[PDB]
Amino acid sequence: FEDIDTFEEAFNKLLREVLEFDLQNPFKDAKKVLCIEPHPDDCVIGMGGTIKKLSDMGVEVIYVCMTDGYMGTTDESLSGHELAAIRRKEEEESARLLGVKKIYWLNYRDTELPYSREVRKDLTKILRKEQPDGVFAPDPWLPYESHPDHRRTGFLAIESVAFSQLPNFSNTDLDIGLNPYNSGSFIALYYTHKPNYIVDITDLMELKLKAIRVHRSQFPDDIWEKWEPFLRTIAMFYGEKIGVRYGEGFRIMPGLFYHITPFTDLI
Amino acid sequence: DIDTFEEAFNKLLREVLEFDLQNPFKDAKKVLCIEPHPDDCVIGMGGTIKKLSDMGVEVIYVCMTDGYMGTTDESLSGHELAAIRRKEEEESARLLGVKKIYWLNYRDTELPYSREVRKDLTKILRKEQPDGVFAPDPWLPYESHPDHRRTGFLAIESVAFSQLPNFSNTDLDIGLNPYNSGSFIALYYTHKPNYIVDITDLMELKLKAIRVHRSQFPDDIWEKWEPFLRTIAMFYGEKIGVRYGEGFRIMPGLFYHITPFTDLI
Amino acid sequence: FEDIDTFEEAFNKLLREVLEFDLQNPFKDAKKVLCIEPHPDDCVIGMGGTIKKLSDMGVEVIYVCMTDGYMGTTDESLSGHELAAIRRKEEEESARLLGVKKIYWLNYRDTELPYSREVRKDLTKILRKEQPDGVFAPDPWLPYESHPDHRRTGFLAIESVAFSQLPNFSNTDLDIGLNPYNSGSFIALYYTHKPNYIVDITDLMELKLKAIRVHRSQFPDDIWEKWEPFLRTIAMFYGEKIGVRYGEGFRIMPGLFYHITPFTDLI
Ligand SMILES: CP(=O)(O)N[C@@H]1[C@@H](O)[C@H](O)[C@@H](CO)O[C@H]1O
Ligand SMILES: CP(=O)(O)N[C@@H]1[C@@H](O)[C@H](O)[C@@H](CO)O[C@H]1O
Ligand SMILES: CP(=O)(O)N[C@@H]1[C@@H](O)[C@H](O)[C@@H](CO)O[C@H]1O
Ligand SMILES: [Zn+2]
Ligand SMILES: [Zn+2]
Numbered sequence: 001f002e003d004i005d006t007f008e009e010a011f012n013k014l015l016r017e018v019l020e021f022d023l024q025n026p027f028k029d030a031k032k033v034l035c036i037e038p039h040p041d042d043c044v045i046g047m048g049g050t051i052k053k054l055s056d057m058g059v060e061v062i063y064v065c066m067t068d069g070y071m072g073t074t075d076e077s078l079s080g081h082e083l084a085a086i087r088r089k090e091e092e093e094s095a096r097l098l099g100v101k102k103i104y105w106l107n108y109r110d111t112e113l114p115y116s117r118e119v120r121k122d123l124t125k126i127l128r129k130e131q132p133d134g135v136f137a138p139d140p141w142l143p144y145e146s147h148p149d150h151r152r153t154g155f156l157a158i159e160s161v162a163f164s165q166l167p168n169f170s171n172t173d174l175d176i177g178l179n180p181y182n183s184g185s186f187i188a189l190y191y192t193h194k195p196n197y198i199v200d201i202t203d204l205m206e207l208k209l210k211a212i213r214v215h216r217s218q219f220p221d222d223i224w225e226k227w228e229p230f231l232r233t234i235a236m237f238y239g240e241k242i243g244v245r246y247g248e249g250f251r252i253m254p255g256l257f258y259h260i261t262p263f264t265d266l267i
Numbered sequence: 268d269i270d271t272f273e274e275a276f277n278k279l280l281r282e283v284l285e286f287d288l289q290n291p292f293k294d295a296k297k298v299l300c301i302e303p304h305p306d307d308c309v310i311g312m313g314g315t316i317k318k319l320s321d322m323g324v325e326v327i328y329v330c331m332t333d334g335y336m337g338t339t340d341e342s343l344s345g346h347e348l349a350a351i352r353r354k355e356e357e358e359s360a361r362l363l364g365v366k367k368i369y370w371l372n373y374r375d376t377e378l379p380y381s382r383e384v385r386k387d388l389t390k391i392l393r394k395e396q397p398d399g400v401f402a403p404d405p406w407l408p409y410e411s412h413p414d415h416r417r418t419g420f421l422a423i424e425s426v427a428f429s430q431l432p433n434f435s436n437t438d439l440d441i442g443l444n445p446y447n448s449g450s451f452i453a454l455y456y457t458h459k460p461n462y463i464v465d466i467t468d469l470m471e472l473k474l475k476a477i478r479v480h481r482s483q484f485p486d487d488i489w490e491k492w493e494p495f496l497r498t499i500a501m502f503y504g505e506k507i508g509v510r511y512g513e514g515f516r517i518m519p520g521l522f523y524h525i526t527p528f529t530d531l532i
Numbered sequence: 533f534e535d536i537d538t539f540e541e542a543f544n545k546l547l548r549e550v551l552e553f554d555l556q557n558p559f560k561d562a563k564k565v566l567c568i569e570p571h572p573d574d575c576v577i578g579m580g581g582t583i584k585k586l587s588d589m590g591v592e593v594i595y596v597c598m599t600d601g602y603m604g605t606t607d608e609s610l611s612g613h614e615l616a617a618i619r620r621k622e623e624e625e626s627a628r629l630l631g632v633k634k635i636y637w638l639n640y641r642d643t644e645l646p647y648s649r650e651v652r653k654d655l656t657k658i659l660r661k662e663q664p665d666g667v668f669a670p671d672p673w674l675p676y677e678s679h680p681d682h683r684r685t686g687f688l689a690i691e692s693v694a695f696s697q698l699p700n701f702s703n704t705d706l707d708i709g710l711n712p713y714n715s716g717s718f719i720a721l722y723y724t725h726k727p728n729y730i731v732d733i734t735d736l737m738e739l740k741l742k743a744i745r746v747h748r749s750q751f752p753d754d755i756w757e758k759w760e761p762f763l764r765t766i767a768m769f770y771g772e773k774i775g776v777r778y779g780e781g782f783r784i785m786p787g788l789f790y791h792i793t794p795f796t797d798l799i
Contacts, residue, residue: 268764271768271772272765272768272769272771272772275761275764275765275768275769276765276769278761279761279762279765283757283758283761283762284758382643382644385643406675406676420678420680423678424678424679424680427678427679428603428643430606431603431604431605431606432605432606432607432608433602433603433605433611433612433615434603434643439608445606445608518676521758521762522676523676523677523678523679524677524678524679524682525577525578525670525674525677525682525723525766526674526676526677526766527674527723527724527725527727527766527769527770527781528725528766528769529675529676529725530675530725
């Protein structure tokens with residue numbers, strides 16, 4: 001498009017006409033979504049209110065849990081194996097409150113999620129099988145995010161969504177009858193410091209906190225005394241951006257902006 | 268000695284470090300342009316490569332990976348794609364006056380982040396002793412390609428470590444010297460350029476040399492990439508009041524370590 | 533909390549009342565700290581004046597040096613092995629100047645510090661043995677920090693402070709008689725672009741510079757011509773933030789803010 005005079009015009013038209021980027025109803029046509037969490041409890045903590053709205057709308061929400069949450073206890077009589085078995089049941093109960101009926105467990109060990117082609121292949125197999133319309137994952141660019149399983153889950157989610165569409169990537173999936181990932185309409189990153197789309201969850205907030213507290217091994221009373229205010233305050237930070245009390249924030253960009261794009265901060 | 272941080276900083280830059288962004292590529296005779304995939308050098312700095320070649324600077328590509336994954340055409344294997352892209356790059360490079368291409372042959376999507384890859388880059392630095400090195404900026408936000416982030420880090424690392432005789436010492440044992448000798452790094456594909464090359468004049472040649480990578484840029488893909496690539500170029504060019512530009516981040520060598528005020532340049 | 537009106541009010545109550553955070557005197561109660569450095573000389577460069585002030589207050593300061601500094605010369609007649617043995621001696625003399633009596637050498641090769649569970653277990657064994665009240669380490673989010681041993685030390689130090697409190701993490705430590713890390717009261721990150729606590733080192737600058745120069749393999753006169761003004765300029769950058777001539781900066785945050793937090797820039 002050789003005749004536009006200003007960057008600001010080129011940018012507006014690139015987004016609205018060339019890429020048809022829309023932040024007004026980005027989940028509009030979604031029939032099936034995957035919600036990718038590093039640990040058991042992260043989908044509900046990051047976006048439980050939105051999962052419920054999606055389910056209320058008849059969207060099929062499927063979790064993919066990267067790790068088993070093996071390490072998340074300070075109880076010296078509770079082994080990692082026993083804790084992982086308990087957290088699987090806690091996630092099932094939590095997910096059921098939010099209308100989720102399927103969880104893919106990848107079973108990597110908590111604190112030890114690899115950053116590797118292998119983990120991309122696991123995600124790629126699920127994407128190719130399920131062909132979701134949209135995928136949710138943490139923002140790996142969150143500053144001061146000190147948990148490796150978080151940063152890696154975000155990177156590996158975005159990478160797999162792109163690479164799962166290439167037939168020479170993990171080519172054995174196609175040899176067993178799966179198609180390339182054909183169907184996706186969006187990625188939405190939660191746990192983000194740069195949200196550009198907010199779901200009002202004011203009405204849903206008590207359901208969210210309830211479904212979070214179902215992860216009892218994680219949230220005994222003394223930890224909840226700190227975590228409840230922390231989670232309320234995060235929801236208010238997001239809410240305020242659309243003038244509501246409580247929200248969940250997502251960063252959504254056109255697919256090209258995830259590569260070589262020097263003006264990602266303009267959205 | 269001096270009164271304020273401001274004075275300290277200005278002095279440090281101008282007199283102690285002699286940092287000049289008016290003409291950073293002034294004395295360059297040989298440069299390495301390090302790209303993650305075949306086409307990255309032409310997309311990110313093709314116009315600048317042309318300008319450099321036209322002024323008699325020798326431009327040498329180092330391409331980290333083989334572009335094996337880059338197709339959705341199920342009739343084309345990665346081996347065949349790789350072979351096609353080597354030829355696409357050779358033709359695209361010829362258009363820009365480019366000489367010589369080192370192919371490292373790591374598989375696309377699988378470039379390792381490791382001492383091994385730093386030794387490969389180091390061997391080339393010590394052999395070629397370039398005046399300057401260009402690479403993607405690994406700090407680019409929302410850069411989701413690991414081949415890009417890893418290439419950026421590894422280049423900066425290798426420019427540093429190839430200067431050290433205990434690093435990859437078998438190089439010296441076979442008769443290579445440590446890398447002098449470069450006077451700069453410049454990062455392209457950067458959100459924080461502080462040097463902009465006007466390429467308004469060369470934009471058409473740039474687009475032609477990009478399209479030479481035909482496996483990457485069929486018509487339906489070009490419908491989106493041409494507006495994107497033009498908008499990028501307008502983004503950079505607007506910063507210096509020209510139509511189409513190419514942006515680079517250049518900093519003094521000290522600033523890539525322990526420096527809390529890098530955003531001041 | 534469900535009754536707080538605005539995000540701005542919730543954030544303030546969270547920070548001050550729930551998390552009890554303030555930066556009036558963060559190092560106040562400390563009897564023992566670990567100063568974790570990527571290379572020999574990094575503690576003194578990043579925080580030497582502070583180390584001396586901690587030793588002057590009777591705090592036991594202990595270094596953990598991740599790597600051997602094997603690569604850090606341009607002298608073609610000096611092997612890395614010889615350099616490593618030299619730099620150990622340099623660090624010992626540097627450390628004695630600042631009142632430090634104990635250094636754990638992990639002995640990873642310089643330029644080759646792994647980013648792995650193994651290195652977290654090394655740091656966890658020392659945390660569990662020492663039970664320090666605080667830990668200092670480089671900020672791994674420093675922009676344009678190009679040295680992988682720096683970013684890796686920072687991330688591993690933060691992770692280790694957290695995972696070492698978990699008894700299923702590196703569980704053989706417990707089996708041989710070490711307790712989980714508790715005692716911990718803070719992490720302070722030095723080499724930071726986002727300091728929120730400044731230590732005035734104006735009258736200690738000359739001692740800090742002498743203690744840096746004791747690392748002679750690193751700072752012969754021709755290198756010092758550049759590094760002395762560089763190091764002065766950094767110290768002025770931090771000092772200016774509290775209206776003094778030379779400072780050392782640290783970033784300190786509540787434990788919760790190192791995870792899933794989208795407003796860490798408000799502190
Ligand atoms: C809210 P979360 O992300 O789920 N909390 C995780 C927990 O799941 C995990 O078991 C633990 C050990 O890695 O670190 C905690 O930080
Ligand atoms: C502009 P580019 O960096 O060269 N485009 C790359 C292409 O080379 C590569 O084959 C593919 C799969 O990794 O990803 C694409 O995103
Ligand atoms: C101030 P420093 O962080 O200690 N300087 C280091 C030095 O210790 C190390 O041997 C060399 C090679 O890795 O890199 C330099 O950048
Ligand atoms: Zn988590
Ligand atoms: Zn260091």
